[PDB]
């Protein structure tokens, strides 16, 4: 026959190959597809879907309903944050459990902006003012409103609009931000603060909650398919 020469690689099975193989059932009448709604083209599409953050994973509150409830209590005007969250989507126990984070558990890198949406779930008749703030990678967690006020932030009026979206820009060093468990990866800081203190109408229960949603953006990507299962 045609002069041939077996080179290195022959007879080896590369799990990640892309070779053709003999069809075990010739001419089988395959049942054609039907356009069932909700096809998925890529995994990064699932992250762009808004998902509820379990902000309060306290000992009694983690793994139950209230892990998703952020209760505006009734404490001092002490700037002590009314929720702080490290934008270390993977290297922080809370963000890791959202659809966003779940996809972010199968790759080594991520790039792009994220957006934190909050839905106020408090009695219409009430008002006040809140401030959601961001703080780029590295900086100490801003502990006083005055500090948080300096970084990228939006004043979210309860009275006016129940929901508030605060996009976290892609402020980072490298082209691909590390999605692994690093010492102290940075890493934004989304945190709401009592701009004022909650105004209440006649006799409302005075304690209401806010929910939080996270999602990636069209500029969000992932590489080097990693894994784990047990």
């Amino acid at each position, epitope marked *: 026959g045609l002069p041939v020469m077996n080179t290195p690689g022959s007879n080896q099975y590369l799990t990640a190959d892309n070779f053709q193989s003999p069809c075990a059932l010739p001419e089988f009448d395959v049942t054609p597809p039907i356009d069932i709604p909700g096809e998925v083209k890529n995994m990064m599409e699932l992250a762009e879907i808004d998902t509820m953050i379990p902000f*309060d*994973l306290s*000992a009694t509150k983690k793994n139950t309903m209230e892990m998703y409830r952020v209760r505006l209590s009734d404490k001092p005007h002490t700037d002590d944050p009314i929720l702080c969250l*490290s934008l270390s989507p993977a290297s922080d*126990p809370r963000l890791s459990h959202t659809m966003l984070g779940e996809i972010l558990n199968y790759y080594t890198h991520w790039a792009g902006s994220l957006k934190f949406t909050f839905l106020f779930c408090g009695s219409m008749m009430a008002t006040g003012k809140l401030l959601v703030s961001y703080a780029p990678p590295g900086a100490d*967690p801003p*502990k006083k409103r005055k500090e948080a006020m300096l970084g990228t932030h939006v004043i979210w009026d309860i009275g006016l609009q129940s929901s508030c979206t605060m996009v976290v820009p892609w402020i980072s060093n490298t082209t691909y931000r590390q999605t692994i468990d690093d010492s102290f990866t940075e890493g934004g800081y989304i945190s709401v603060f009592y701009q004022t203190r909650i105004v209440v109408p006649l006799s409302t229960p005075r304690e209401m909650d806010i929910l939080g949603f996270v999602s990636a953006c069209n500029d969000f990507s992932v590489r080097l398919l990693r894994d784990t299962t047990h």
Partner: nanobody
Amino acid sequence: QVQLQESGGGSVQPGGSLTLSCAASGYAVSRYSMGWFRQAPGKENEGVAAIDSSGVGTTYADSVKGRFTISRDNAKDTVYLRMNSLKPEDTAIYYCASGFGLSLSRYTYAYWGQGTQVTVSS
């Protein structure tokens, strides 16, 4: 990831004291801080003491202010809760947790604990 164990919990007496501690894992306590929450049986989580690791400046709840103390050692990887002048209300399910910092706020704490019960008026 990090699983810090609540140590020092025991049933003492009114007007008394008790030392508490939590040893690091997953990371060196020094980056995240550490604090304590005493969720009184049948009531919400109740903040008591918080301290920052790499920037020591303590914060206490007003209900326990003056009497209660908190300290840290980043070298022994443990956080030290000094509860002084303990009373009958101070009977709660205590908890230590790590957050950012140093800010007693129901949460703003990640990994918690198992729950150590200090029955002051025993």
